[PDB]
Amino acid sequence: IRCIGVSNRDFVEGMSGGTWVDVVLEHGGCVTVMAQDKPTVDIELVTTTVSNMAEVRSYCYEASISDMASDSRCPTQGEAYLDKQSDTQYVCKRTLVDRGWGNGCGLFGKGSLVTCAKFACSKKMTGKSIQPENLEYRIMLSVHGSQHSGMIVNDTGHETDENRAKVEITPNSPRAEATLGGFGSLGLDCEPRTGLDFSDLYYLTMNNKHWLVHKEWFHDIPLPWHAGADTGTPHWNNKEALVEFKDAHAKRQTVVVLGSQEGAVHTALAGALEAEMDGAKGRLSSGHLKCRLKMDKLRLKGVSYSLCTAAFTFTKIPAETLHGTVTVEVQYAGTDGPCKVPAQMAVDMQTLTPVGRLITANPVITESTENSKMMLELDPPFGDSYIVIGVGEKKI
Amino acid sequence: IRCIGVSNRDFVEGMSGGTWVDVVLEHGGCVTVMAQDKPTVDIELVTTTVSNMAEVRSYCYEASISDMASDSRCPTQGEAYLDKQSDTQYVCKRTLVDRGWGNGCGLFGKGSLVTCAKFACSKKMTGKSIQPENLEYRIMLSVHGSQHSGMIVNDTGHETDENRAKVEITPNSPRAEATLGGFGSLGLDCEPRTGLDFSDLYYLTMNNKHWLVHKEWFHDIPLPWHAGADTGTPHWNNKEALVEFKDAHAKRQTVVVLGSQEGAVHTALAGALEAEMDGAKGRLSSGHLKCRLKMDKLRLKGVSYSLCTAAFTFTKIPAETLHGTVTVEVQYAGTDGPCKVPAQMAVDMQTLTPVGRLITANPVITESTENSKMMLELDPPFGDSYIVIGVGEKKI
Amino acid sequence: IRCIGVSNRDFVEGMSGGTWVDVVLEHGGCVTVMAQDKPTVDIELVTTTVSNMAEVRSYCYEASISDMASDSRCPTQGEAYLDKQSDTQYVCKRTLVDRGWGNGCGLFGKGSLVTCAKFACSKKMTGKSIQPENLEYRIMLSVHGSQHSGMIVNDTGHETDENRAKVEITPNSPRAEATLGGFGSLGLDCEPRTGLDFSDLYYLTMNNKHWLVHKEWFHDIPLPWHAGADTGTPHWNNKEALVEFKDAHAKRQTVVVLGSQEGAVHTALAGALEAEMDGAKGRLSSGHLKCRLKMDKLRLKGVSYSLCTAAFTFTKIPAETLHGTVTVEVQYAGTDGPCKVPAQMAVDMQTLTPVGRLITANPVITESTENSKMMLELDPPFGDSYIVIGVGEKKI
Amino acid sequence: DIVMTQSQKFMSTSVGDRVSITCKASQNVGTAVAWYQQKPGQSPKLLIYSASNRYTGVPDRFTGSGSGTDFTLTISNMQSEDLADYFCQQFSSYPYTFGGGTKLEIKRADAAPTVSIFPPSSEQLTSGGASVVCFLNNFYPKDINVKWKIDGSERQNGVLNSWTDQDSKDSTYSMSSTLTLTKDEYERHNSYTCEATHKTSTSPIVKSFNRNEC
Amino acid sequence: DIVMTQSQKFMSTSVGDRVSITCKASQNVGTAVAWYQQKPGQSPKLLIYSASNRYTGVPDRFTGSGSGTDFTLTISNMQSEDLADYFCQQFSSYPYTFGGGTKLEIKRADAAPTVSIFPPSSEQLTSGGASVVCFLNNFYPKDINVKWKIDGSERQNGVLNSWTDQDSKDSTYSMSSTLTLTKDEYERHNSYTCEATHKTSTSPIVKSFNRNEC
């Protein structure tokens, strides 16, 4: 559960170091802990939420130019400054240009032009900082046993119904004890500040999308960048390099917009995780954690029962999984109190002997409903073998 | 005249070709042209006026700072920009500074300060451009003969009394012919655009003083420079470097004015001519010219006269001059029409043979006043020679 | 406290020499003394005040000239002295100048001019002497233990609170015993006359600013210098060299002011400490001292308490500091008499062994207020580790 | 959205006056305010930007001041070329709203209107419509009110008023007031009156005719 | 020298109003204009610089606009803390002259003054001077005029008027008007009257006494 089809599988054999088993979790995969002292517990990471981000720099995806004007003082002369050079907010470039004679003034020699243009950004891209504090995690975990195989993926009983607890982990609390009612509680300790390798990742937003960026990328990029701390009106740095003021060879110095770059930043970003967000907070998905799982208190709830009478049927037939495990659904029509279900992977029948690991721990169908389902899974040996259920002459 | 005491002397005696003698003139000195058959003409440069100058760049001798303010965004942000960064006209420097905890915010590693100050210049220094066009010259010239030695230096009548004339020379007219009434006219041709080596000299003004500056000095100097073309309000370049914003290991970043530099520019200028000006126009004094003097038409203002009777006296006694010439004043009480005055430098007594050059040309006292003065000068030899004046037994 | 964010850090391991640990202090930084025999004491220098300064020489930043006059005695005749040569206070320079003929007197070889000008200074710069006597120091010191982390930087109480104390050290008293109430008293011995390297530093004032200057600079500088001992009226030495009396080849000898130098002295001073004042005493800031700290009597006030119950909840979340130490705020809701606070940096989870140095000494929250804060800081090992606070199941 | 209120839509000024034009923002806009002047047939021209900065080429007679919600354009030593419409505009947030405008006109001595009344022409009375025209010419100040009566009863519907711009030479205003009614109604009444209320008389100027008289 | 004219020395405003303060320069000053506010006992504080730029920390309610000769400070959504004196200043050339100031005060409902008249005290009448005092208390608006009469004849010399600042709680004004004359003249007349003209009454409030009556 929260397992099987996921296809990225890690089995961790353990129950030695007093449940000291340490495990890594990756948003792609999941690790199942099988320990004789315990029912087999399925851990998977889900979403790592980041909250309380702050803005750092920003950029201009799409430049826009407004009012182009110029003046020239003829021959040697402190490039006559337009008024537009005093307001910032205007690009200006002072170049040398021939004004001969009928350009209006003697010494058709080399003069100077000063061209200026108002510069107003369109759209934007605003980095954001992510700090190890106010970092969260979400670990959903579940326990095989035999719950209804249709419940393999659900989030309705996140806080109730057999094995299924939603554990939060955030810095100021490396530990959370997940109480799975009746199985005891799985001691869980994780290092939030270590694994994900943050503080090197600025959180980045183009128009209605998101990313992550290693610093020394987003810190160094050649576009106009707002100072980022004040949203009142942009007072830019840069402001060249998204605007190329260029000339030919006569009397003119022209200016060009460059037609945003929004296609560049995309095609520029490579090897940067995708990301999504709901409001002030945002949810990455790339898992990394180092969790030392304390298996200390886990109480098998399938001990001290009888063996469920004879009346087992397959529903949907068995199947093979990935790394080679097998799953089974069994519907025990046997009307009894919650009861233990015999299952053995047998090599032939010359002598019904246990062959190969049975990893559901102890399947126990809990209902009085007289018709119930339990999904138990097991990994039989390499050669041909039987999966067997029940101990009565009605066994199937 | 316009000669003698000047002590920087050039004699030019090569009147060969059709009065083609070429002469150089230096505001310090003067050259006298002495040519057999032509009265000796004294040329001297006086003042080279420059007019219709234009402004090029300018600088700030004395900085002044106004309103210092700052803000800081605490570790992990950008440098929070003050409003004062959008107006130009404000120096701003963004530096890194520790803000530890009770500095108000966690992350005790390094934040950022942005300090800004209004920057308003006090006084100024404004270069000006000098172009070869609208360049003038002034050449005063005079002719020895014998006018009253008290008139050696005067200007009240540079176009009437004696044989003085004030010649102008400006580009669009390399030639000026000075008509000295009765001596004919001295053909004069000068190259204005060549000699003085202009176009490399910006005309420069500190407070109420003036200079000249080779370009590649005044073009490169490290001070705040106004663009020079518009006087409405300064929109500076530079700005820094007359203002040092400095900090000390702390929460502070301070700012200093630098207390003008006006003493630097002075002590910086060396080998730069002094200059003065009488308004829009200004008068350098350093002479250079190449003048080809056409001696063609010069009439001897002393031919076809008698010899002035006997009655010569010395007034003020003779004297020696510099390069070795001798001057003499003689007051001929002889009452006669304007008449020629005999003078001979004779080595010996009895048979008075001419010895050594007599360079006044032909001294001719012009008055009917019965008491007149004539200043004639001549260069005798080394050996004890006599200066002699007169022909009658009354000669002195 | 008086530490953490300062970012210039010196840790000085205990001294098994009987509180004989010797420490250097620099106005930039601070050294923390950690000794098992003691609570960890934070020392920092603040301001070194200098008082009872005396004036030595002075200079003239800005020269001003008043009345220029001259006379000349003609050739044979010494330089006729103006009356202005008898008053001092007047620059005078006797030069040789041609007076020919109509300059009024025979002998056209070379006369003499004497030009003189009244010389009156504007502004001034007055050095001052600093002597090792009447030299002070100010050392503020504080002790980590338990204290509102918001109090990390404050002065309101310097004579009260937990234990802060403001220690003065001046020559005639190398020692001061700082009594931090209840912690005993830190024996402190410092050599005032040695460290700062004075007697070589004149204290220097331009207009409304200050500096320090190595002697053999301020003693040798080429400007007019007042004798410094009497303020009645300036009787200068020098008085040339801020005034250049110059003249070309003519009848004139001119004189120039030089337009202060105030920009020079600034641009001249480099590698010179800048010191602010406030009247008669100037506060430098550059620290140097050799202080032998006597740790003899320091009584830990956190011994013989219980362990504060369960109710520990971090605030401001932890953070990293500079050289790698960690700070923590903890608000112990559980209220009792001052109760010792358990803290251990643990390399595991199950059995918590002490790992890495805990340097706050013994954190003891002193209040009855039932809600209190204590800032304890500690340096854990290199690898991943836990910071742990509390002993009860409610520990966080 | 931000409202910029110029409460004085019209101002009369003499050459040399200090003119004060006020602009009030409905919320704090800091210093993000521009001032323009506009003359007929032309685009507006910028005078002041960001509350207090004079644009290049603008005479130093123009100064902007204020911050927050209250902004003022001052014209010192007003000249005749300054007669124009003036607008403020804010740039604090979109939309970049303008004030309603203040039209500056020139003062001269008061002058009573010359009033003339015109019955419908015979040619118009072939049409079934009838217009009675009053011209009120060469008056100052511009404020004037016209009341029409037919056989003693005021008529407000069907009155159209048109004003000339202030005359470029004599600084007066002129107005046409036209009462339009059906021809049938026009021929059912005899007395037609236009009454002009203006500050130059304590009672209105009355022009009236009886349709059937000569 | 440049004259900066703020023609409105006093403005009454309600909280929430758009306030327009005008400054007119006597010659073109470009955008070289600042605006300040000042409260009693404090130095002025900068609001707007170079015509249109809002200084940091100033509420966005304040916006400067204009250029050339005409400058405006607009306060949108005026708040009670904006009550203050406002000044423009130009930086085109020395001297850096200020406008004359505009004092912003708050509007409330009109309120008639309560007027009380006080003959000279017996103690003052030992002195040879005599002061007759009228208090005119708790009125709005501030504009009020007091005329004194002695035995029917107006007296203007010797009248001293003093006004409180607008009250911080009730927004009213109060005034003392004191007629000082010699004791000898005071005892030669019987009737003394102070008359207060104020917009709250069509005729002045009259307080009068006869010296020799009780």
Author numbering:
A (entry chain A), B (entry chain C), C (entry chain E): 1 to 396
D (entry chain G), E (entry chain I): 1 to 214
The publication says:
Here we present a cryoEM map of ZIKV strain H/PF/2013 in complex with ZIKV-117 Fab at a resolution of 6.2 Å. However, only two prominent Fab-bound positions were observed, one (‘2f') closest to an i2 axis and the other (‘3f') closest to an icosahedral three-fold axis (‘i3 axis'). The additional density at the third chemically equivalent position (‘5f') closest to an icosahedral five-fold axis (‘i5 axis') was weak. At the 2f site, the Fab cross-links monomers A and A′ of the i2 dimer and monomer C of the general q2 dimer. In contrast, the Fab bound at the 3f site cross-links monomers C and E of the general q2 dimer and monomer A of the i2 dimer. The structure of the Fab-virus complex suggests that the antibody functions by preventing the rearrangement of E proteins necessary for low-pH mediated fusion.
Zika virus (ZIKV) is a member of the Flaviviridae family of positive-stranded RNA viruses, which includes well-known human pathogens such as dengue (DENV), yellow fever (YFV), West Nile (WNV) and Japanese encephalitis (JEV) viruses. The nucleocapsid complex is enclosed within an icosahedral shell formed by 180 copies of each of the envelope (‘E', ∼500 residues) and membrane (‘M', ∼75 residues) glycoproteins. A recent study identified a human monoclonal antibody (mAb), ZIKV-117, that was demonstrated to possess therapeutic potential, with no cross-reactivity to other flaviviruses. The mAb ZIKV-117 neutralizes ZIKV strains that belong to African, Asian and American lineages and is able to reduce fetal infection and death in mice.
